[PDB]
Amino acid sequence: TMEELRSLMELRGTEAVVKIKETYGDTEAICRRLKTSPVEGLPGTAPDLEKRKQIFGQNFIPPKKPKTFLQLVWEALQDVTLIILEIAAIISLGLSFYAGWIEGAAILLSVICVVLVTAFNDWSKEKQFRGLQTVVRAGQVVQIPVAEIVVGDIAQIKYGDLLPADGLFIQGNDLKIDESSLTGESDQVRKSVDKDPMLLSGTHVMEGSGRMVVTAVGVNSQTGIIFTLSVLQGKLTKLAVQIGKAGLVMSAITVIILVLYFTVDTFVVNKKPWLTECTPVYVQYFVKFFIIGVTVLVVAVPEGLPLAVTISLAYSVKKMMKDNNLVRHLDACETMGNATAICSDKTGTLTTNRMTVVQAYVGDVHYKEIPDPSSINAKTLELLVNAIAINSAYTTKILPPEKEGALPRQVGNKTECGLLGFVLDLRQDYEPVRSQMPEEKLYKVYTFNSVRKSMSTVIKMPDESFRMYSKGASEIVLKKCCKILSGAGEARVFRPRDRDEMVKKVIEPMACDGLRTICVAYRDFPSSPEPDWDNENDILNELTCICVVGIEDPVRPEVPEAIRKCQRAGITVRMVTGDNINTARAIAIKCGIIHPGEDFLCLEGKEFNRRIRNEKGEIEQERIDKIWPKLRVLARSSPTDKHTLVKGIIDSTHTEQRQVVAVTGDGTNDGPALKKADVGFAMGIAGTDVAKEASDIILTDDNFSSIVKAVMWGRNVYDSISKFLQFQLTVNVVAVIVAFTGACITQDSPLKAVQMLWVNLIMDTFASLALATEPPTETLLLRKPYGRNKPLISRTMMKNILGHAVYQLTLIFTLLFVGEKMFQIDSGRNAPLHSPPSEHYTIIFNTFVMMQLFNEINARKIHGERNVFDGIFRNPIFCTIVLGTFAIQIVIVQFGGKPFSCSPLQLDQWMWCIFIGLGELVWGQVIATIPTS
Ligand SMILES: Nc1ncnc2c1ncn2[C@@H]1O[C@H](COP(=O)(O)OP(=O)(O)NP(=O)(O)O)[C@@H](O)[C@H]1O
Ligand SMILES: [Ca+2]
Ligand SMILES: [Mg+2]
């Protein structure tokens, strides 16, 4: 019974419609089973619906968890670089047992630090995105959070509302719903009691409005049937595989050279006969060679790059959440860095959406300020307030602020609220006028819509008389009026010459001042000759204009600076609005989108469609290629005309560089365009669920300036990866060269296995955390957007890599060769197998570590910036990582002995190594001078 009725709604056809007429009557026939408050409202008692809904079931129930922590660690364990590292560790541990174990431990100490942290991110972010994600419940004032939905509710459906649950249609006007989410057909189904009262969860309402109780709301319906049953990343992966291949080749060459050298020396040259008892010692040498190659591989493989990308993305998202940006698609964090065009709507985003009356043309006299009630003649003020109050639709009201004496809140549409505010400013009150006729004697109402741009109201209160007010848009209604009420209640004939003269004199200044012109009129019908209200053309004419009002929405305080920043950073801003061309241009001038004197083009939607379409109804992109390069303002735009623009920009090949666009579209009809744009923002506070569902990033404060932040952070992400590539790529060069030289000369590979693994831990794992959490700077907004074919390794990065590599190689080789004479500390070269560690090689290892540590500090400036120490303390992880590494290096060198192949060093050598380390900063300052070109 609780789910039996669902079978009916499964029919989806005329069979379902005839089923209710067979035995189920209507909705009211079976609603008797429960209370359901048919024509009344729920009292709101706490234990109310326990009796009706004996078993309580909510669709709010989510899945338990997509993954657990153990599963997340297992998932993160499967990466190519990590597979190579694990194989190398297994081989090292296997060969050692035949302190040889410690080397393997080092590798594992990397792998864990790579997986766990990553898993933690995938455990936290996945939670937060789940955490982020007033209801359709209707009554007297009943508005409750969206997360319960129960059977028997009275849902009021408006245009653009997303249906939260299935139901049956009671009453309404022209409800058209898109059911492509469940049927796959994008045709607008028209819902009615007689033909198709079925409503489905997840469908989007396109047109009309109405009411709904319930068909069967729950997961047992078709909703639960399904439930129960990156360019940057690719380039980084390609770079990683290239580096891995190069490292493998170098390791193979080094191993071959060492093995061949030893074999030629021991057998061919010395003529030593091979003896079986020497077989054990021999293989020891071989093992000591083989592990070296493995270590080189572990050095060359860039295991820290995926970690750096993950950390940068996660940190950027978590800090963007502070800047009023909710990120639903992670990749959209990066793409917004390369945005080169921003298409935005006027109302809401650029304007505060609070409309107040500033200018009026009452009594045939223009007033730039709201006039005193004494100045306006009698019998005109009363007519004006009556007309405004009656046309205010009786739902809009100026509610008292009640919050520290703030501005009064506006509930309904902004134009009627502005007119009501004008009435209040005239020291008149509309409440008694509304109470006199609270829809009691309201004869006929012409509902406002975007086509007519007006609304008419018929009052039969006068004795056997009809009065129609019919406020308009000052361009449709104004030309229809045939008389004008001016002076002391004098009605004079309005002629077309007077029409054009008053237009030019009065209407144009408001439009050029950024205001929107609204006309108020009224007309009286004789006694009762005929109710010829069937035709609208012959009834909406012969009006008498009372006054003309200019309504303005103030521009946001911070959007001019944001637009200036956007235009400075190479991003062009275009505005799409439904206002007339004059007001749109005047507002865009104040916003700074279009400069006063330029060749920018602003045209209406009608001529847009006419010009971009060559003969016949087809639309050609070749025509669109001419309009979009210099189209700044679009006025009287249709809901679809934005989409036609966005596509025209994205699929354009005439421009040498490709275009990445961001559309700040909010609204139900903005669904297609929002999906076409590379990054689609949606307004948060006033955004319908339809627009927010298909959005990439959500702006909580619905402000344009926050979009600028979405630029900066995005670019920051790129830079972070770049600087990591500046550090790792030099170290794995120098070491790979040094060891290779140690293969050709001294046959020793100066840096042992454990020391090279310590360097690997320094440069791969810890460096990702160190250089992947850099806070962003505003200077990132001072460069042109980066192309999508730009090389990952810029020219300055390679210059720095080569200069620092040259310095490091020179110092290391000079030390390795002449340190016996320089430090008078004896020679460590050509040391025999199983020999005590020498101080000469410990000096080399310590100097190498110190130079890498200072290269980490001086490698934070990719763009040739001289002041390296700029903003170090703004990052609290970099300093602690560097200092901890320094302390660990000290304790390893001093206390660590045979296992790490390091001997205690006196203070003099330590100070000289630190001075050589400071030499790295000196050399960086020197190399900053040399021009790149
Ligand atoms: N309550 C109203 N009664 C009569 N005319 C109205 C009313 N509200 C607005 N208008 C006029 O009719 C038009 C309807 O368009 P509307 O979508 O309300 O605003 P817009 O500014 O044109 N477009 P947009 O910027 O997207 O909000 C307005 O531009 C006014 O000229
Ligand atoms: Ca490595
Ligand atoms: Mg519109």
Author numbering: 27 to 124, 149 to 183, 193 to 288, 339 to 1042
The authors write:
Plasma membrane Ca2+-ATPases (PMCAs) have a crucial role in this process by extruding Ca2+ against a steep concentration gradient from the cytosol to the extracellular space. Native PMCAs form heterodimeric assemblies with the small transmembrane proteins neuroplastin (NPTN) and basigin (BASI). Here we present the structures of mouse PMCA2 in the presence and absence of its accessory subunit neuroplastin in eight different stages of its transport cycle. The structures revealed an overall classical P-type ATPase architecture with ten transmembrane helices characteristic of the P2 subgroup.
